[PDB]
Amino acid sequence: VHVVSRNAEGVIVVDGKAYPMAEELVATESVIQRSIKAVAKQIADFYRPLSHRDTHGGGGVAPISDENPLIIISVLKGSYIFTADMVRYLGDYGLPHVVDFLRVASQLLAETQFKALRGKHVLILEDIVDSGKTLRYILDKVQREHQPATLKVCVLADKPGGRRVTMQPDFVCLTVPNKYVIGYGFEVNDRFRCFRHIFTLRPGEARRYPAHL
Amino acid sequence: VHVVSRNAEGVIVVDGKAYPMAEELVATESVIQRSIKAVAKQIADFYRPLSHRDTHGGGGVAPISDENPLIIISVLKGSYIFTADMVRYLGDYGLPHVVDFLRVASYKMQLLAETQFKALRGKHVLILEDIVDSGKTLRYILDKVQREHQPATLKVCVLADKPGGRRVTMQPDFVCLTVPNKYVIGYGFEVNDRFRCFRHIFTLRPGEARRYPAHL
Numbered sequence A: 001v002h003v004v005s006r007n008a009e010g011v012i013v014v015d016g017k018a019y020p021m022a023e024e025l026v027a028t029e030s031v032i033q034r035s036i037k038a039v040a041k042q043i044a045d046f047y048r049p050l051s052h053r054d055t056h057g058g059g060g061v062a063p064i065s066d067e068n069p070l071i072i073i074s075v076l077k078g079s080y081i082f083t084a085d086m087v088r089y090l091g092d093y094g095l096p097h098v099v100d101f102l103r104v105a106s107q108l109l110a111e112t113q114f115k116a117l118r119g120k121h122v123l124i125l126e127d128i129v130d131s132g133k134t135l136r137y138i139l140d141k142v143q144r145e146h147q148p149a150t151l152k153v154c155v156l157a158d159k160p161g162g163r164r165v166t167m168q169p170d171f172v173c174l175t176v177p178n179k180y181v182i183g184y185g186f187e188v189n190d191r192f193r194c195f196r197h198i199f200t201l202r203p204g205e206a207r208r209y210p211a212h213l
Numbered sequence B: 001v002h003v004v005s006r007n008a009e010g011v012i013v014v015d016g017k018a019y020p021m022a023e024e025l026v027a028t029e030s031v032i033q034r035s036i037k038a039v040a041k042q043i044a045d046f047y048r049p050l051s052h053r054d055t056h057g058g059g060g061v062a063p064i065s066d067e068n069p070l071i072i073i074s075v076l077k078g079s080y081i082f083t084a085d086m087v088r089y090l091g092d093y094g095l096p097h098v099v100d101f102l103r104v105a106s107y108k109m110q111l112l113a114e115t116q117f118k119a120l121r122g123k124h125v126l127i128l129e130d131i132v133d134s135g136k137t138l139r140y141i142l143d144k145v146q147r148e149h150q151p152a153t154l155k156v157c158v159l160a161d162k163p164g165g166r167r168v169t170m171q172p173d174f175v176c177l178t179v180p181n182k183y184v185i186g187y188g189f190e191v192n193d194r195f196r197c198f199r200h201i202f203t204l205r206p207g208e209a210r211r212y213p214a215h216l
């Protein structure tokens, strides 16, 4: 049970901690973790029956295994906390997998280092689908460079009211309101990512830290 | 609570799960998490009262704050799970901080991925790293960060210290756990990217080190 209240300044307090930058609470840690673990079970149940290119034993097709694991691509920097939690739940459910990272910014800043993804099942882990443009860019790049057998996306958050292009992730942990979200990886110039809960940001507060880090 | 035992095949079992690649258990999840949170308190207590360059007001110096946070550089890939947990404990203790990433590798050391932060001059910088073993990886990182960013101070926090592996002087400022002089796996520690998702840290059976020879 989380304790959620407001102090005399009208500021949201969760478990004794004040969040003056927040407009509303979206999800507590308990709700977020339960939602991630539920999707981890969906992911493990979906992939464990599948087979793909055998690079351990010299061809042809073999079951997903520790020898030929599911390939996971995590999008830095936003998905790193979500990924750390998800992979541990995937391990709990016994899904063989390995993780590489790509970094994008608003440009590709860092490329994946994995070089044998041809004919492999590949799952992208991303923080949020809002407009859909970021994931359309990533999916196109990953498909053209790696030629995977299949390419799917799991997002922590879906903001369905923000779409500008068609983008429907295969796995969604939580739905967020049509507002700027902060906490659990979600940032304002790298601030707020360490919050264990997700909140909506007070309007105009997205310009609070103008200085480039 | 955790139950650690061996099954009829002599294989380590933790909470009903078998780890046939493991020689010994080093630390359970509960011990690891307790250790990380304790260091988080040390880090917060150490940096909370300090001041450094003010880039928010373009001013001279100002306290560590959300306006001028502690700068954390996390070393990929091994430190990402440790970092995700540490930052949440650092937030619990109210330490203002931001995180960027660098990645290094050996062929001799070379940078695989650079940090994107460009205003670290006169700032307190903390490196988060998975393990100090020989010390060569961190000596390379510290020398590069120091010359290229010219921070006010540069310190290192490691999840693990393998004391007997040292070949160059390197004692991190903060150490969560001490490990035996053996190859460790779990909680970010890998064998060709396998085993990183384990919630516990184990030593590796020596015959398992070359189980996954194919490049990913």
Ligand SMILES: O=c1[nH]cnc2c([C@@H]3N[C@H](COP(=O)(O)O)[C@@H](O)[C@H]3O)c[nH]c12
Binding pocket: A078, A127, A128, A129, A130, A131, A132, A133, A134, A135, A179, A180, A181, A182, A186, A187
């Ligand atoms: O509500 C939000 N809070 C915090 N970040 C974002 C983003 C960021 N923009 C990227 C996704 O963009 P989109 O789907 O709009 O192209 C995310 O990876 C985040 O970097 C969109 N919406 C949000």
Ligand SMILES: O=c1[nH]cnc2c([C@@H]3N[C@H](COP(=O)(O)O)[C@@H](O)[C@H]3O)c[nH]c12
Binding pocket: B078, B130, B131, B132, B133, B134, B135, B136, B137, B138, B165, B182, B183, B184, B185, B189, B190
């Ligand atoms: O026992 C170990 N288990 C898993 N990885 C390592 C490493 C890796 N080598 C790097 C640092 O080693 P060193 O201090 O010897 O230069 C770590 O960041 C790890 O990625 C050293 N020892 C170990």
